[PDB]
Amino acid sequence: KVYSCDLTTLVKAHTTKRPMVVDMCIREIESRGLNSEGLYRVSGFSDLIEDVKMAFDRDGEKADISVNMYEDINIITGALKLYFRDLPIPLITYDAYPKFIESAKIMDPDEQLETLHEALKLLPPAHCETLRYLMAHLKRVTLHEKENLMNAENLGIVFGPTLMRSPELDAMAALNDIRYQRLVVELLIKNEDILF
Template structure:
């Protein structure tokens, strides 16, 4: 009883802290809907905006959560850098950034292998991160950069993740068919999902944020751990965040059928920890030393999915 009360108090404090951050997001969302900008000139308009925010229709937790979750799914926010490779052009070619001629017989410039943009090598350092992948250039689904794939297919998450999770959930819990023929099939589907996540060139929890999540798991205070994990989640690229959010919601549902599938949050953390987060140096010793923290990060994200995402 005491442990439950402490856990409830912890989640309550964390929700209060996160609510302050989300308040600013809600203000920006309302300002955007009214066509105004927040700032020195927008302060005069802030009072009516604040009154609007207090309306039941807007402040409803369900509507507010839906609005906030829809915001990162806008494809325009899925920023992606170009994937330039040295290229030899046949015939005259002009740089699509500076509009100057590309001189030389070989290796005159670089071409983005995802969208086909042709520029000088020196101009490639100045091109903004506005790559719009062309589906005709994306030759594979597995081992393809996550953001590249979702932008090419005009989706918020990889279709592999959606398709596999939908099929797995159709067979979970009391509906699970554990006969020999069906059992092998569901393992194949689950294996396909894990293989896709494991083969991503950049893991769902990106290399540059790996150490931040590992250090968060090492914090002795439970509240600080959750706060640090939440901070890390906010720094993920939108496509990675949305994929992780969808995965954690699915795994949270899996745990509700623990008596059938024997998979609680800790067991799922052991299974998915090394899949969702990998050390950038790919060192076996580092991976072994970090396994406990990897497991704990995923376990906490599952247990507190409704608070962290």
């Protein structure tokens, strides 16, 4: 129903700007976790994360993800990451992906940012909107680094292989794409304010 549904299809079915999972998790996270050490890196218990999935699948916007039901905020960051992991077409789509990697390869910061802007335009509206919202939230997470120890680089490690998927099968290129995907995430968080 919710998890593993196509992003565009889900938001069209609900007439919302972005999935309830995304808005609800980010709200919970921002209310109780911006200063929590290792936010997004630290795993909550896998089974409790599965349970959150089961709840959204069953109840949609009615799902209970409160501190009462799940004390550890890393269960919620876990649920949100799983949500993007479960997308049939990833947040940064197969189609748009090459333009993001193109941007990652550029050495000049300004031309790199320009190409990143163009890559964003290639995403379908629902993908662009969810990514925008995510990136605003991730920026806030990094502003709390003194407390949470997370910066754009650290978050790029976590999010790089979740938001994007490499089609490549070739050892040097594979390791390269992993680093490029992390850089794409880092640039998106850092420059969210001027890219969206």
